[PDB]
Design a protein around this ligand. Structure first.
Ligand SMILES: *[C@@H]1O[C@H](CO)[C@@H](O)[C@H](O)[C@H]1NC(C)=O
Lengths: 104, 438, 49
């Protein structure tokens, strides 16, 4: 009849031979929306249309890294804080009040 | 002097490289592959086509018996019958009231148009590649052609060249391949000796004019019912034609890597895969030395615009203050920027506009005029025409595919996390070793 | 290629712009409306005098 036929072409290329014509080769380059130099969110609506299974794992990697860094540093320095409460019961005063203002 | 490099294997696009020695001037070296055929070593087994059942005029023996022999022609089938009484036009062709016998034999052989319409069944293995490439050294050119195993040089006028072995050695063919009328297929035909009735490989011959052919297509005879004389027979459908109906698309348009497959030497021209290593020697007649070469001073490149595409998108201007005038090589020492202008003509206070093409989202590479380097940053934009009829001259390298800012965000975002872990560890150690001594 | 631009609707006064391709020199582009007609869809009912 008369029909539209969607195809898909990556970086490596594609040819099509319609009837008794000669083959017509076509290579496809990137025009993903956004901008790799604009600082906001549009820097990763670009790298999602190009290689989508890599951007999600690298974003989850850095989000897991920042949460584990914040949690591990907070827990370890809180343990190191509680390992320095040798003056208790307040019957003498605190040793360095500037250090207690830093800590408490 | 000897210089070795590893070009990509895509027919058509060059690979820019330099050579340099102690006390000598640099020299440009672009080489490209213009034809690359992949021919395998074939071995023919048999030649087959559509058959033609030949039935001779049936014997009849009157008031007697008749038993039949064994013959060597293809699919010979005999059968005798007791008590027939045949009529030709003048009736009663036998003087024997229902005690006579007849013979009925049939066999099979080639049709008279199989000298054009025959399929050939081959068996291919160990495809070895050959390259026609174009060496350009020191404003001189040379055309040559070499085998690509790493031991066989093919020279051209004092220019030796060792093509090392290709990384991914393969062929587009299987172990078994069949050809009719210039169309290669990719089929699994039966061995010469195992005939299946009503499938491909039905007639067999080592050559199409041979005498001792082999067939098995179940000629079975039937008892003559009617009084007129003829020989009833049935036969399976021709396996060559009911293959030819279901042949599928040929391997001229289903083979990978852009291979164009011809038939008459059974080659596979212009396949695009892998990398090849090349080791050439350059004669000393082209290596000009630095005592007479035009040396260079005060170079500072800068960019004006950059797209990253397959066409030459970027364009950079350049300043240079040479003391003398001549021809100095221009090159970029990256692997993501290929530079179009191979050579230039320098003057005292002039300026050169160049062209390049990239795939990295930004350009941080160094260009080189006549011996010494120069650096210049850029900022490249995505293009709009996202289908073009020209292949990419570069690769991506998968680390420079991120810009400065997209690299910079995530690297700062977990550098801060690692640094706060380090400072928590050191304040932990400091407080612990302060208190445990008490 | 095609270059999008919103010219204002004031008859006579041009709106200059230049276009830019990579590797090619920039090219100017002047756009001006010179006369604009506004025609509706007309349905006649009657005639009186
Ligand atoms: C070609 O190379 C030779 C090598 O000495 C050089 O003298 C000559 O000027 C070059 N020719 C051109 C046109 O650049």
């Amino acid at each position: 009849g008369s029909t539209s036929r969607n195809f898909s072409v990556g970086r490596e290329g594609l040819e099509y031979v319609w009837g008794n014509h000669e083959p017509v080769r076509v290579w496809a380059q990137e025009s993903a929306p956004g901008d790799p130099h604009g600082w906001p969110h549009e820097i990763i609506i670009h790298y999602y249309h190009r290689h989508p299974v890599y951007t999600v794992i690298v974003l989850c990697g850095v989000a897991l890294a920042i949460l584990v860094g914040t949690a591990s540093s907070a827990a370890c320095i809180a343990k190191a804080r509680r390992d320095c409460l040798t003056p208790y019961a307040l019957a003498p005063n605190a040793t360095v009040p500037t250090a207690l203002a830093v800590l408490c | 002097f000897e210089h070795a490099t590893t070009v990509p294997n895509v027919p058509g696009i060059p690979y820019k490289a330099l050579v340099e020695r102690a006390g000598y001037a640099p020299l440009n070296l672009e080489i490209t592959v213009v034809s690359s055929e992949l021919t395998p070593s074939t071995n023919k087994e048999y030649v087959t086509c559509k058959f033609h059942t030949v039935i001779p005029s049936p014997q009849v023996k009157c008031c007697g018996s008749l038993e039949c022999k064994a013959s060597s022609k293809a699919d010979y089938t005999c059968r005798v019958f007791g008590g027939v009484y045949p009529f030709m036009w003048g009736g009663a062709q036998c003087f024997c009231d229902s005690e006579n016998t007849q013979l009925s034999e049939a066999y099979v052989e080639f049709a008279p148009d199989c000298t054009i319409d025959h399929a050939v069944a081959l068996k291919v293995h160990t495809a070895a590649l050959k390259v026609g490439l174009r060496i350009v050294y020191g404003n001189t050119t040379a055309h040559l052609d070499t085998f690509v195993n790493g031991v066989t040089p093919g020279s051209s006028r004092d220019l030796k060249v060792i093509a090392g072995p290709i990384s991914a050695a393969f062929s587009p063919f299987d172990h078994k391949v069949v050809i009719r009328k210039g169309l290669v297929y990719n089929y699994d035909f039966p061995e010469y000796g195992a005939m299946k009735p009503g499938a491909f490989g039905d007639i067999q011959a080592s050559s199409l004019d041979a005498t001792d052919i082999v067939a098995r297509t179940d000629i079975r005879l039937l008892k003559p019912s009617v009084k007129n004389i003829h020989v009833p027979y049935t036969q399976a459908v021709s396996g060559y034609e009911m293959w030819k109906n279901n042949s599928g698309r040929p391997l001229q348009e289903t083979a990978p890597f852009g291979c164009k497959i011809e038939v008459e030497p059974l080659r596979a021209s212009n396949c695009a895969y892998g990398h090849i290593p090349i080791s050439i020697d350059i004669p000393d007649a082209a290596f000009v030395r630095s005592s007479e070469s035009p040396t260079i001073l005060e170079v500072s490149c800068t960019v004006a615009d950059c797209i990253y595409s397959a066409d030459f998108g970027g364009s950079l201007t350049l300043q240079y203050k040479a003391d003398r005038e001549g021809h100095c090589p221009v090159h970029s020492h990256s692997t993501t920027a290929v530079l179009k202008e191979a050579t230039t003509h320098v003057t005292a206070v002039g300026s050169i506009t160049l062209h390049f093409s990239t795939s990295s989202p930004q350009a941080n590479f160094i260009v080189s005029l006549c011996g010494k380097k120069s650096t210049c940053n850029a900022e490249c934009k995505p293009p709009a025409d996202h289908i073009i009829g020209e292949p990419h001259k570069v690769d991506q390298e998968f680390q420079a595919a991120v810009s400065k800012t997209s690299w910079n965000w995530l690297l700062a975002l977990f550098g801060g996390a690692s640094s706060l872990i380090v400072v928590g560890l050191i304040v932990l150690v400091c407080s612990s070793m302060l208190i445990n001594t008490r």
